[PDB]
Every structure is written in C-alpha cells, then in structure tokens.
Design an enzyme around this catalytic site. Structure first.
Site, short mmCIF file in Angstrom:
data_model
loop_
_atom_site.label_atom_id
_atom_site.label_comp_id
_atom_site.label_asym_id
_atom_site.label_seq_id
_atom_site.Cartn_x
_atom_site.Cartn_y
_atom_site.Cartn_z
N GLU A 97 18.81 63.26 35.41
CA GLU A 97 19.83 63.82 34.52
C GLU A 97 20.98 64.49 35.25
OE1 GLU A 97 20.05 63.14 31.45
OE2 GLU A 97 18.01 62.57 30.87
N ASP A 144 27.68 62.21 28.07
CA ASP A 144 26.57 61.49 28.66
C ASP A 144 26.83 59.99 28.67
OD1 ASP A 144 25.92 60.51 26.10
OD2 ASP A 144 24.06 61.62 25.92
K LIG Z 1 23.00 63.12 32.29
#
Ligand SMILES: [K+]
Ligand SMILES: *CC(=O)N1[C@H]2C[C@H]3C[C@@H]1C[C@@H](C2)N3O
Ligand SMILES: [Cl-]
Ligand SMILES: [Cl-]
Ligand SMILES: [Cl-]
Ligand SMILES: [K+]
Length: 164
Positions: free
Chosen positions: A11, A20
């Site tokens: 992440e 994202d």
């Molecule tokens: K991410």
C-alpha cells in the site's frame, strides 16, 4: 515478515490525500476515505477519521493509527463473515495474512464473493486456487500486487515479499 509489513509494502505510505489505483481518495497506508469524486467530501471523511480539522495532511503517527484500525477491522470482518471465517480458520499463518491482504484491498463482501477460489483454498489445492484467483478483475487491475498475494497462497511462504 508479518501482515503489517506485507500491507505496508503493497500500500505504500503517503501523508497527503491521494487517489488510489481506482481513482478514489485515500491517505496513509491505503486508508480509503471515500468513493465520492468530491475532494471536499474526502477531506470531511479525513477530519472525522482523525478527530481534528486536518485539511488533507496527516502525520506518520496518524497514518499508522488508521493502519492499525484497518488491519484489525479486516480481521474482525473475516471472522464475522460466514463465508470467510471457515476459510481463514483452515489456513496456516502465512496464508491467513494473504487473505487479510485481499480483504484490506477489496473489502469483506468482495472477497466473500470469490466462492470457487475460497473452496479451493479450503481444500488446500494451492496451484488450482492460484490459477482461479488470477481469473479476476482484481488480478487484471493490480497484477503485480495480485501476483504477490497469489504466490503467497500458492507457496505458503513469504518469498514474493523478499527483496522488497
Ligand atoms: K495505495
Ligand atoms: C489510532 C491511534 O494510534 N491513536 C488515536 C487515538 C489517540 C492515540 C493514537 C493517536 C491519536 C489517534 N490519539 O487521539
Ligand atoms: Cl475530484
Ligand atoms: Cl478473467
Ligand atoms: Cl499491482
Ligand atoms: K493444487
């Protein structure tokens, strides 16, 4: 390696609101704020999550707080889900982390829908499960990350996260 280190690799860490892979406002270590296209709506979510007027930037400590909450929530979501709990219970420690990783990324309901893959995992048919998991929007949209998670399910090792 552990679930925290694994998800930190997958992440990243960013202290300002960003979009994202799906274009959704996010902050920290993969903390989704909202699917709304409104940045102001995302900032409102952030302020509520942090408990202060933040205008879109957080500290590393605050990012790690949301990450602790989000990992805990993924585990609790697995254990409360009638489809995911038996699979999780059947798995070894490394593969449990792979399942938490999927839930962190896609949510409990999304992973719970991988009915045939989940059965193959319960059956410990690891190569077959890996082939089935790749036949997915998930694998097409985030192939490098999905490859790492799938290798973890195939092998039951942390090999895909070594060198990272
Ligand atoms: K991410
Ligand atoms: C999640 C976390 O680590 N926290 C939250 C509650 C307390 C202690 C820390 C930092 C911050 C947010 N504080 O309000
Ligand atoms: Cl926007
Ligand atoms: Cl497909
Ligand atoms: Cl990817
Ligand atoms: K197999």
């Amino acid at each position: 390696m552990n679930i925290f280190e694994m998800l930190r690799i997958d992440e990243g860490l960013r202290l300002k609101i960003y979009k994202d892979t799906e274009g959704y406002y996010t902050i920290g270590i993969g903390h989704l704020l909202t699917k709304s296209p409104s940045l102001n709506a995302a900032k409102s979510e952030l302020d509520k999550a942090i408990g202060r007027n933040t205008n879109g930037v957080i500290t590393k400590d605050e990012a790690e707080c949301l990450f602790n909450q989000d990992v805990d929530a993924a585990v609790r979501g697995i254990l409360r889900n009638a489809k995911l709990k038996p699979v999780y219970d059947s798995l070894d420690a490394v593969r449990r982390a792979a399942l938490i990783n999927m839930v962190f990324q896609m949510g409990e309901t999304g992973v719970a829908g991988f009915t045939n893959s989940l059965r193959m995992l319960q059956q410990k048919r690891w190569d077959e499960a890996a082939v089935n998991l790749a036949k997915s929007r998930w694998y097409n949209q985030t192939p490098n990350r999905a490859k790492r998670v799938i290798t973890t399910f195939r092998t039951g090792t942390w090999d895909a996260y070594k060198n990272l």
